[PDB]
């Protein structure tokens, strides 16, 4: 009943359009330190939408268009190469206490993805290896997944804001100063206090 | 278990001789043995920090104290002489001593002393813009931390160089 | 002294950057063979009535605790420090070409951990996905190779014999030539 | 932050050119302009297939007027499509194979590129007292801020321990880091 969205639905979402719909979840992770929500919808879209372009290319004889639809397909993928080139890293990095956050709600399709598979391998590779590290008298009080190791809770990595929003002093839920908002300008800020607009995707990132 | 460094036990191993409010007892690695388990309040009382890192300045064990480079005579006029003052490599734990210790001393005066050195970066690295030449011109007047981003300071520009053209 | 020893670690990888002859798991003996040798010191007073609960072990508890504290996270590095640029070349190639020379169990665990990536990658079902070679538009499949003095000789890919250095060149199809880029190879196709 | 993050991006924009793939693009017809993203003119001009003429800001009059317009810009200025540090890179590479006036072009762009950074130290020589919630994009360009993006922000946290800490963290009468 709620059909006719710009996703894969009852319309043609342009190869230049479908370009757009995952652009920000690449760019947020660049200029931001911790996990942002990841959506497994693309495991329908991107595996599929372009694969249907493949079969049309599979129907592969031209000199021009054999490559043209593909030259796209390269450009479509040196992001997706790049995308989880880090997200693999991001929680490999943040194996530490992300279990606590991911045990809060088991965040649904929006936050992580089937990211949860690395969790099982995280402890396995951290235990097995240590089996020949320090095992004669192996750990004594913080013997499990200990408390002290954390990769990246520093939330103040001063972030640039892609102004694409309410220009005037559009004031929102945030603890530091947020005066003097702008559609072109900005007052530069850190991640913690503004973790709201990009869950909303009202505001944006550079 | 920290904001790490490769030298993580060249972290709290710098030594200071802060005095004692109290008598002494068997420092172990010292000439302590069956020889002395007691001395006076105040002595050349060496302090490689790691044992006293959270050992209750407020409690009557040891004293308000400074290593005299960290005393005002350098610092409080190194904030006046914050102009072409040098740091070399001389006391490298000097962005980062005060990131820990200088409150722990409990003289409620010294944290502000620091930054106004490092406030100068907003008007220091105007000179720091670019790379003319070799990998070794004047690369020896650093701290344990500024050098890293300074290399990085070069680095983005060094590959901003290739942003231009084939260069 | 009590583990300030990684200042010695710093030289093992010096030639071993992109001109690596071979690596060593070495230098590790007494930095290892003391560590719980000195637990016996750590256990000398571990829950001992030597002083019956007073100050006098807390300053050296820190010695008891710091001593570990440095041992671990350095010993994170001994694989982690070693996991980093090995992952990088292991990004430059899958296990098409592993190292020219319980780390294999951790590598196999990392290879199984990378599966997650491979599952979504290429398709829903999964493809060990080309990320690091053939920005080639693919041309005809059976023409030979050329290199720039590669070393290690792991090319196990579908060819007669290649002898992987410069002029590793035999009638090698596309299935063979899918290995490496920037480890001494790509002056030429 | 990169040489080609922009070329991931900026060439995605499109312009009408001179010479069907699905897209808003139409089929191709001799003698007949066609708006295309700019990652085909690669594959035409270097393919010795067709030419291309630029957008309108690409001239030595409109931006030989801007040479004084931005002296208003105590903050920022006129921004003709924001991307004239990338397209001009590739345009002036190959476009001047037959295009005229590739020089004052080349002049002004450096005569405006290096300059608006030359202010940028200056405005950055106004930051005082952890002034985190004051900043400037007000009519910023596209291809500049990357050249400071890694440096100070991977500095300021180890400052902002003591700069940004004030407006939610407190100690005794002296200042806190």
Curated annotation (Swiss-Prot), chain D:
The keyword Manganese does not apply. It is found in: Nucleus. One of its GO terms (cellular component) is GINS complex. It comes from the Eukaryota. Disulfide bonds: none annotated. Gene3D superfamilies: 1.20.58.1020, 3.40.5.50. GO terms for biological process: chromosome condensation; DNA replication initiation; DNA strand elongation involved in DNA replication; double-strand break repair via break-induced replication; regulation of DNA-templated transcription elongation. Keywords: DNA replication, Nucleus. The GINS complex plays an essential role in the initiation of DNA replication. Component of the GINS complex which is a heterotetramer of Sld5, Psf1, Psf2 and Psf3. Belongs to the GINS2/PSF2 family. This is Probable DNA replication complex GINS protein PSF2.
């Amino acid at each position: 009943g709620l059909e006719d969205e710009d996703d894969d639905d009852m319309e043609q979402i342009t190869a230049q359009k479908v370009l757009e719909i995952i652009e920000t979840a690449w760019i947020n992770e660049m200029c931001a330190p911790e996990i942002l929500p990841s959506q497994t919808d693309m495991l329908e879209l991107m595996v599929s939408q372009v694969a249907h372009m493949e079969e049309q290319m599979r129907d592969d004889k031209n000199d021009f268009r054999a490559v043209v639809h593909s030259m796209e397909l390269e450009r479509v993928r040196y992001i997706m190469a790049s995308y989880l080139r880090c997200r693999l890293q991001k929680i490999e990095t943040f194996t530490q206490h992300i279990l606590n956050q991911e045990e809060s709600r088991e965040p649904d399709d929006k936050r992580l993805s089937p990211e949860t598979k690395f969790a099982q391998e995280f402890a396995s590779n951290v235990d097995e290896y240590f089996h020949k590290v320090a095992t004669q008298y192996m750990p004594n009080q913080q013997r499990g997944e200990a408390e002290q190791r954390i990769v990246t809770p520093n939330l103040m990595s001063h972030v640039f804001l892609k102004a694409n929003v309410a220009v005037p002093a559009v004031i929102v839920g945030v603890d530091d100063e947020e005066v003097d908002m702008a559609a072109g300008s900005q007052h530069i800020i850190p991640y913690q206090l503004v973790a709201d607009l990009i869950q909303n995707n009202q505001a944006q990132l550079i | 278990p920290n904001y790490y460094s490769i030298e993580d036990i060249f972290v709290t191993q710098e030594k200071v001789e802060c005095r004692v409010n109290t008598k002494l007892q068997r420092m172990g690695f010292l000439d302590s043995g069956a020889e002395s388990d007691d001395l006076e309040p105040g002595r050349t009382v060496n302090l490689p920090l790691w044992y006293i890192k959270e050992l209750k300045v407020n409690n009557a064990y040891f004293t308000v104290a400074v290593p005299d480079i960290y005393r005002n005579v350098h610092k409080a006029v190194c904030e006046a002489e914050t102009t072409h003052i040098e740091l070399g490599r001389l006391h490298p734990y000097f962005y980062e001593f005060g990131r820990y210790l200088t409150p722990y001393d409990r003289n409620h005066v010294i944290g502000r002393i620091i930054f106004e050195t490092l406030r100068q970066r907003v008007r220091h690295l105007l000179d720091i813009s670019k790379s003319d030449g070799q990998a070794a011109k004047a690369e020896h007047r650093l701290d344990n931390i500024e050098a890293k981003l300074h290399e990085a300071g070069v680095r983005t520009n060094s590959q901003y160089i290739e942003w231009l053209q084939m260069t | 002294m009590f583990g300030e020893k990684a200042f010695d670690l710093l030289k093992e990888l010096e030639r071993s950057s992109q001109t690596i002859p071979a690596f060593d798991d070495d230098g590790v003996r007494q930095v290892l063979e003391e560590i719980k040798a000195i637990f016996e010191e750590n256990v000398a007073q571990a829950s001992s009535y030597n002083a019956s609960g007073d100050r006098s072990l807390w300053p050296l508890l820190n010695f008891r605790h710091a001593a570990l504290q440095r041992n671990k996270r350095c010993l994170l590095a001994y694989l982690y420090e070693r996991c980093r640029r090995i992952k990088a070349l292991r990004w430059e190639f899958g296990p098409i070409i592993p190292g020219d020379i319980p780390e294999v169990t951790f590598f196999n665990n990392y290879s199984k951990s990378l599966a997650a990536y491979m599952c979504s990658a290429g398709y829903n079902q999964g493809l060990p996905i080309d990320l690091t070679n053939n920005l080639r538009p693919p041309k005809s499949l059976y023409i030979e190779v050329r290199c720039m003095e590669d070393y290690g000789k792991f090319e196990l890919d579908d060819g007669e014999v290649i002898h992987l250095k410069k002029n590793s060149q035999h009638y090698l199809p596309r299935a063979q030539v899918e290995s490496l880029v920037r480890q001494g190879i790509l002056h030429h196709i | 932050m990169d040489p080609s993050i922009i070329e991931f991006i900026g060439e995605k924009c499109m312009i009408s050119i001179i010479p069907l793939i699905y897209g808003p693009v139409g089929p191709f017809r001799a003698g007949f302009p066609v708006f295309v993203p700019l990652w085909m003119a690669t594959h035409l001009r270097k393919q010795q297939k067709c030419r291309i003429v630029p957008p309108e800001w690409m001239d030595m009059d409109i931006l030989e007027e801007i040479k004084e317009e931005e002296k208003r810009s105590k903050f920022f200025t006129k921004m003709p499509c924001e991307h004239y540090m990338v397209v001009a890179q590739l345009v002036m590479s190959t476009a001047p194979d037959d295009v005229p006036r590739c020089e004052e072009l080349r002049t002004v762009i450096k005569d405006i590129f290096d300059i608006r950074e030359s202010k940028l130290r200056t405005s950055i020589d106004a930051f005082i007292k952890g002034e985190g919630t004051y900043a400037k994009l007000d009519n910023l360009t596209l291809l500049e801020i990357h050249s400071v993006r890694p440096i100070l922000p991977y500095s300021l946290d180890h400052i902002a321990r003591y700069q940004r800490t004030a407006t939610a963290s407190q100690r005794d009468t002296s200042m806190l880091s």
